[PDB]
Amino acid sequence: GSSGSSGDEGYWDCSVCTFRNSAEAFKCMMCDVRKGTSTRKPRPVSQSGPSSG
Numbered sequence: 001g002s003s004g005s006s007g008d009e010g011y012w013d014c015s016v017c018t019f020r021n022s023a024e025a026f027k028c029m030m031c032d033v034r035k036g037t038s039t040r041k042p043r044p045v046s047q048s049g050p051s052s053g
């Protein structure tokens with residue numbers, strides 16, 4: 001189709017509307033559905049205290 005990488009390639013294929021979105025685009029453009037999972041690992045967490053005894 002087109003030849004000439006302006007910045008950085010990496011288009012992601014949406015799942016909700018199955019539309020083609022560009023990497024630069026934070027979220028979808030067709031359905032506008034958020035893609036950034038932003039999931040939190042089940043890893044443990046404790047109160048942040050003094051690193052040094």
Ligand SMILES: [Zn+2]
Nearest residue numbers: 014017028031
């Ligand atoms: Zn979409």
